[PDB]
């Protein structure tokens, strides 16, 4: 295990914990705000995936300050994880190309 593959893996586990904590905390944040749809755990979990990937369909979104603060942490964990996989793939390819050039 090279750093880049350990980091990629670490980021995958950590993203899964953020999707779950974020589902829980969003529901807690959002109930009490009239009109809020982000208020049961199963679709909160769907919401957290859709936010973390940045698809953002808009079937669900938080309307409270704390729902929105939670949503910002999910966006950033998701963009960073997926960026940390791209960076780990780039590290693999560069090494392979060196080895091939005979370097």
């Amino acid at each position, epitope marked *: 295990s090279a750093l880049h593959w350990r980091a990629a893996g670490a980021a995958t586990v950590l993203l899964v914990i953020v999707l779950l904590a974020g589902s*829980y905390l969003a*529901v*807690l944040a*959002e*109930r*009490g*705000a*009239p*009109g*809020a*749809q982000l*208020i*049961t*755990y*199963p679709r909160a979990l769907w919401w957290s995936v859709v936010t973390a990937t940045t698809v953002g369909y808009g079937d669900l979104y938080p309307v409270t300050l704390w729902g929105r603060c939670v949503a910002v942490v999910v966006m950033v964990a998701g963009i960073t994880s997926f960026g940390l996989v791209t960076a780990a793939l780039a590290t693999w390819f560069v090494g392979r190309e060196q080895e091939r050039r005979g370097h």
Partner: antibody
Amino acid sequence: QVQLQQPGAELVKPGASVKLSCKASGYTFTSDWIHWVKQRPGHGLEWIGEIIPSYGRANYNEKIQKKATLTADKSSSTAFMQLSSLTSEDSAVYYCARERGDGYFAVWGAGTTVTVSS
Amino acid sequence: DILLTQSPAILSVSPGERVSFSCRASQSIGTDIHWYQQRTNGSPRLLIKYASESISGIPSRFSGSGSGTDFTLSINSVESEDIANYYCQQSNRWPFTFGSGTKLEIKR
């Protein structure tokens, strides 16, 4: 098993308060909300409010005069609703129900009949 | 806050016949509608959740249907144990709200 356990009745004097209770058993998750519903004699059900015992966070029906204050004791698996400064408009049956956070009341208490009289 | 309208308030059917209770929502709530039975001096009892999904415990006689603003609980072959008050409740938007309710009533 009986999952929610409520007292059968309380008498309360006009202007007095009372602390209703609800002892849960069976599966008691972190994810669980306890709800309180008020049924006046020959009327329908009114959602009054909800507490999550794990966090102790509570929301109320703001469409009505606020009489309730929801508290949970996580050690004794018990939800409380303090109803204060009661008139006769407040005479009713109050149920607790358990919602798993997917939006429906799976399991109800038998309810507490609260009579406000002198 | 969402408004659950249950009309009519009383429903008179003959024994063995099909009965339908209506719930209309004031704005679209998908299928986030659940139905409770309350017999004289009983607690409410979940019958249907998510509009059409069965709860085990419940006679197959009980069905539900509907999507958006129009929901229906059906009892195919009403029997005497069905005499009760039927309520709808939505979990689409905060807070949870109930219907005004519908008395079923058999003409024997």
